Design a protein around this ligand. Structure first.
Ligand code: SF4
Ligand code: SF4
Lengths: 594, 594
C-alpha cells in the first residue's frame, strides 16, 4: 500500500552542486513544548510515501535521475536495443504470458566508447557526480554541519566521518570501500551508498499471479525500510515481471543472472554457456538492474571440499554452477570469462555482487575450507573487476555461530581489500525454524557492527515456506533495527539521536511522539488514541535542586569520622530539610517544570 | 494448555546416589533409517507434558522433592505457621477475594536451629544433596560420559566441563559461582542450576480474573522453555493468587517482596519499614518462593547520580526505595537490615537475587556512575550474604548498546566475584517498540555468550502494553534460542548436537524430524502432513567417490607447468571419466545410498 508513513511526513533537501536534486527523507515532528527539532529518518520508500505524487504502475515512477545522467554526456542512446525473446519469459504465450510493460517512451542508454561511465571510474578521475552528492546529503540525515552529536561507540578501526561530504563519498568509492549501484538505465532510482563508513543498509527479496501483486511486494518492502530489493523470480515470465518492478522501483534492483539463464535452457544446468549468459546480462543491463549476483567464485577444485559438509552446497545459484562444473569438468565459465563480464557491466554501470556460492547452510559447515577458498577467490576477482572500472561488493554467510562471526569479517577485509560486505544474516543457530528472522538478527547486528555494509534479510518462516505479507514486514523491521543496533554500537553520527529522541519521549510522557518515532509506527500507533490530549510533561530530578548534596556529606563522614555522628550535623539537619521539601512538594522524584 | 509437546515425548532418568529421583527430559526420535539416537532436550514444562500424570490445580502438583528434603533431617515442621492476614490480599473480601487454595494438608518447614539448610551451606560442608545430583543429570541431557561431542567455541575463560558430575555442581555452589533456588517449602519443584558453567537459563514473568487464568500463564510459559517464573503480581489478592501458582509450579518461583509490602501499606512508599517487610518475607518463605529480588543496592547518595539521566530510574521496585529514601533521608533499610534479611532467607533456603534498582532504561543512561555504584554495592552485599550461607545471584541491565555489553560483564565478574548474572536483555536499541523481544535478543545472546547465567525475557510489545498469550510464547522461544545461541558460541557440550541433528535432518530430507527438532515444534509442524510418507534420503557427495582428485592435479599443473597442458593429461582424461559417470548417474551432486 501507499500513502504517507504513519506519524511522519515526506521531506526533501535540495542539492548545492546539483540544484536539481531532491534528496528524500521522512521527518517526525515532536510535541511543540518539547523544544526539540523534528527527527529526520532515512526513507527508501520513494514517491509512494509522498502524497503529492500520483503513482501509476502502468506508467511507472518518474525518471528523476535520467536528466542528470545524460547531462554528463558520457552516455548515448542505443539505436538498436535488445527486443524481448520467447525464452526471456520461459516460452510463455497467450493468456499465460505476463502483461508487457508499455516501455515505448523510455530511452535505453549505453556508454560512449572511450568515455567513463561507472561511479568508480568517475571517482578515480576526481569527478563528483550527481549521485555522489545525492548520497552525501542522504547520509547526513538533514543534520547541520555546524551541529553534530557526541558519538560514543566502537567501529573497530572504521573511517566514519562526523559529516558526509560529496568529496568523502568519492574517496570511498575511489578505493573501492563503497559503491553506488546505479545503472544508467534505471532513471527511477533514488541513489544510495553501500559501505562500512556509512549507514548499514538492508535488502528485501521478491520474485514470482498478477504483476501488480509483484509490484506490491516491492512497495511493501521499501515502505518499511528496505534499502535495496532483489528480484529472485524464477520459472516463466521472468523478463516481463521484472519490467514492472524496475520501472516502479526507486531503490536499487538486484538479480541473479544465472536464474533466468537457467530457465532459457529449460533448467538443464549443463546447457548453460557464455552465449546464453552474455545475452542474459545485456538483457538485464538494458532494463536497469543495478547489480548482479555472479557466482564466479565457485571453482571446479572447490567442489570436493564440500564433500565433508553437513548440509553441503545450499546456495541455489552456487549449486547450479557446481552441477555445471561436474558435467563438463571445465572451470567455472563465469570465472574464465570474468574479464568479458566486466566489459559488459561497465558499459551500463552495473555493480558487482560476488556470490557466496559455497556459503554455509549450517553452523557446522561455517568457516570451512570450501567457504574461505571461494572468499579469497572473490578478492582476486575484486581486483580484476576494479581494474575494469566496475564497482564491487562481496557476499558472505549464512549460518555462523557467534564465536566465528569475527573470523569471517577479518578474512573479508584482508582478502577482499575492504570491499563492501553483503551478508545473509548470519544465522547464529539452526534449531529455530519460524524464528530465523531473530536468530539471524543476532548475527546480522554483530557482523554489521564488525563492519558489514549491507545485510540481506531473513524472513521468520524461511526454513518452513514462502513468506506472507506480514512476515515480509516483520523481516524488514527486524533487519532495520539490527542495522541500527550496529549503527548505534559503531557510534555513527546520527544513531543515538533517534535513540535519545524516543527516550526523552518516554521520559516526558509524550506518548504520541514515542509511537511516531518507533521503527514500526503502524504497530506503535495501534496503542495511540489521536483524540486524547497530546501532553508533554517536562520534569526535573528532585536532587538536582539540592545544593550542597547532604547525602554525600553524611556518607563521607561515617567512613572517616564515626565520632562526629553523635550530634545533629549540618548535613543531618539539611537532610531533614530535603525530606520536608520532598514530602511538601508531593513526594515526587521528578518535579514538573510546567 | 497441557499434553505432550508436539513431536516429542516426556522421558526420565533415575538417580544413582538418590534412586528416588526422576530427572525430566523430552526426547525427539528421528527416522529409523537415519541410524541416529533420539535427541534429548531440556524440558522445564514439568508434569503438564507428561500424559501419565493427571494434574488438578485444585490439588496441586505432587511434592516429589519433599520426601528427600525431610530425609536430610535438617528441617522441622513449623508448629505455628503464619496465617493469612487481610492486607496480604489487599484487604479484599467477599466476592472480590481470590479463591483460597486448599493448603490444608501441606506441611510447612523451617530449618532446625544449628542445622544446615541452604545448598551453599551443604556444598561448603562437602555434602552432595538430592538437588545437586538432580541438576547434574539434567545438565548432561541424558548423554553418556563415554561418548562426548567435539565442542568448538569461546567461553571467555569459563570453566565448563565435558560432563557435569554431582561433585562438580557442589564445587560451583561452594564458590558461589552457581546456585540452586530451592526453598524447603517448594516440594513441587524440579531442581535446576543457574551458573556460567551450565546451560543458559531464561525467565518468564507472570502476575495479576480467575486464578486458573494466572496458573495458565505459568503453564504456558514453562511449556515452551521458561526455566524460572516470577510472580510480579501487584494490587490485591497478591497472596492467594501466588498460592495457586507455587503449588502448581515445578519451576522456581521468583518474587519482588517490596511489591506486596507496598500494597499492605496502601501504595505509600514512605509507610514501608522493617516490620512490614520482615512479615512479607516470612509470608513468602512459608509459601515456597525460591528467590527474592531485593533492591538493597539503592543507597541514598546514589539517587542524585541519576539526576542527569535521560529516562531516570525505570526500575519499579528500585524507584520505590528511591522515593522512600527521599521521604526519610535514612539509608536503604534493605541495606541497613541486610544481615537480618539473610537470617530469614537462610532458614528456608531462599536464594538472593540482588536487584538492579538503578538499571538503565535507555542506551544513553547505560553504564553511568549510578548503575555501576549499585553494582559494586551488590558485590559487597554478595559477600555478606555468602557469609550467612545464602545463595546469591546478581541482576543487571537493561538498555545497553552492543559496544558496552562487554563492559557490563567485566565489572560484574570482578566486583560480584563471579556470582551468577541475571539480565533483563539487554536491549541493544530504543527505537523499536513492539519488537523489543528481538532488540533484546541481540543483547541477551551476546552477554549470555560473555557469561551470563540467566536471561529475563522481554515480550514483543513491552513498551506498548500487556503481552497476550501468543506474545508470551514469542518471548520464551525468542529467549530460548538466544540462550542456545550463547550456548552454541560458548561451545557447551550438548549444543551443537541439536544444531547438527536438525541440520542433517534438512540434508537427508527427513521433513518430520526437522519440524520435531525445531525450538517451536507447534509452529514447525504446521507445515507438516502426518499422512505423507516419512522419507529419509541418505546421500553422499559425488566427489567423495572420486579417488585421485583430478581437479586438483589440473589446477596444480597449470600454475607450475603451463607447458604440460598441450597434451591430454591423465588428469584431463580422468576428468572426462568423471564427467561421464556424473551424467550417467543422473547428473546429481548427491548420489543416494539407499
Ligand atoms: S541530600 Fe537528598 S535531595 Fe540532596 S542530593 Fe542527596 S538525596 Fe538528593
Ligand atoms: S575430479 Fe571431479 S569428481 Fe573428482 S574430486 Fe574433482 S570435481 Fe569431484
Amino acid at each position: 500500500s501507499t500513502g504517507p508513513i504513519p506519524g511522519s511526513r515526506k521531506v526533501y533537501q535540495a542539492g548545492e552542486l546539483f540544484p536539481e536534486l531532491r534528496v528524500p527523507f521522512r521527518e517526525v515532528a515532536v510535541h511543540p513544548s518539547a523544544n526539540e527539532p523534528p527527527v529526520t529518518i532515512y526513507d527508501p520508500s520513494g514517491p509512494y510515501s509522498d502524497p503529492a505524487i500520483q503513482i501509476d504502475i502502468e506508467k511507472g515512477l518518474p525518471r528523476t535521475r535520467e536528466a542528470l545522467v545524460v547531462a554528463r554526456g558520457d552516455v548515448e542512446e542505443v539505436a538498436d536495443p535488445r527486443q524481448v525473446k520467447p525464452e526471456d519469459n520461459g516460452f510463455a504465450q497467450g493468456k499465460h504470458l505476463a502483461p508487457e510493460f508499455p516501455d515505448t517512451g523510455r530511452k535505453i542508454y549505453r556508454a560512449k566508447p572511450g568515455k567513463l561511465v561507472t561511479q568508480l571510474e568517475y571517482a578515480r578521475a576526481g569527478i563528483i557526480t550527481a549521485e555522489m552528492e545525492y548520497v552525501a546529503i542522504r547520509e547526513n540525515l538533514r543534520r547541520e554541519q555546524d551541529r553534530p552529536c557526541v558519538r560514543d561507540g566502537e567501529d573497530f578501526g572504521a573511517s566514519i566521518p562526523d559529516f558526509v561530504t560529496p568529496e568523502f563519498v568519492r574517496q570511498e568509492i575511489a578505493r573501492g570501500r563503497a559503491i553506488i549501484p546505479a545503472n544508467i538505465n534505471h532513471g527511477e532510482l533514488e541513489p544510495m551508498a553501500i559501505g562500512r563508513n556509512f549507514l548499514v543498509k538492508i535488502n528485501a527479496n521478491i520474485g514470482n499471479s498478477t504483476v501488480a501483486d509483484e509490484v506490491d511486494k516491492l512497495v511493501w518492502a521499501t515502505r518499511w525500510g528496505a534499502d535495496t530489493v532483489m528480484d529472485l523470480s524464477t520459472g516463466r515470465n521472468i523478463h516481463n515481471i521484472r519490467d514492472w518492478i524496475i520501472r516502479n522501483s526507486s531503490v536499487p534492483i538486484g538479480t541473479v543472472p544465472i536464474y533466468q539463464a537457467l530457465e532459457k535452457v529449460n533448467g538443464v544446468a549443463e546447457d548453460l554457456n557464455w552465449e546464453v549468459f552474455r545475452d542474459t546480462l545485456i538483457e538485464q543491463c538494458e532494463q536497469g538492474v543495478d547489480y548482479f549476483t555472479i557466482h564466479a567464485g565457485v571453482r571446479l577444485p572447490f567442489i570436493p571440499m564440500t564433500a565433508k559438509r553437513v548440509t553441503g552446497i545450499v546456495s541455489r545459484g552456487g549449486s547450479i554452477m557446481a552441477k555445471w562444473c561436474l558435467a563438463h569438468h571445465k572451470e567455472n565459465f563465469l570465472y574464465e570469462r570474468f574479464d568479458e563480464i566486466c566489459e559488459i557491466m561497465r558499459a551500463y554501470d552495473v555493480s558487482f555482487s560476488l556470490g557466496d556460492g559455497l556459503r554455509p547452510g549450517s553452523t557446522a559447515d561455517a568457516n570451512d575450507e570450501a567457504q574461505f577458498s571461494e572468499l579469497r577467490t572473490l578478492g582476486e576477482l575484486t581486483k580484476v573487476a576494479w581494474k575494469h572500472g566496475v564497482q564491487v561488493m562481496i557476499e558472505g554467510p549464512g549460518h555462523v555461530a557467534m564465536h566465528k562471526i569475527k573470523a569471517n569479517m577479518d578474512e573479508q577485509l584482508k582478502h577482499c581489500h575492504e570491499a563492501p560486505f553483503y551478508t545473509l544474516g548470519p544465522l547464529t543457530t539452526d534449531i529455530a525454524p519460524g524464528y530465523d528472522h531473530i536468530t539471524s538478527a543476532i548475527g546480522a547486528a554483530m557482523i554489521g557492527w564488525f563492519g558489514t555494509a549491507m545485510l540481506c534479510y531473513v524472513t521468520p518462516k524461511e526454513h518452513l515456506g514462502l513468506p506472507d505479507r506480514d512476515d515480509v514486514k516483520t523481516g524488514v523491521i527486524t533487519y532495520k533495527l539490527a542495522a541500527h543496533a550496529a549503527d548505534l554500537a559503531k557510534g555513527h553520527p546520527g544513531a543515538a539521536m533517534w535513540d535519545d529522541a524516543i527516550s526523552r519521549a518516554r521520559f516526558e510522557f509524550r506518548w504520541e511522539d514515542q509511537f511516531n518515532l518507533g521503527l514500526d509506527p503502524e504497530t506503535a500507533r495501534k496503542f495511540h488514541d489521536e483524540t486524547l490530549p497530546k501532553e508533554a510533561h517536562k520534569t526535573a530530578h528532585f536532587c538536582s535542586m539540592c545544593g550542597p548534596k547532604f547525602c554525600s556529606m553524611k556518607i563521607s563522614q561515617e567512613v572517616r569520622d564515626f565520632a562526629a555522628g553523635k550530634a545533629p550535623n549540618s548535613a543531618e539537619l539539611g537532610m531533614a530539610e530535603m525530606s520536608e521539601k520532598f514530602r511538601e512538594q508531593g513526594s515526587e522524584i521528578y518535579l514538573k517544570t510546567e
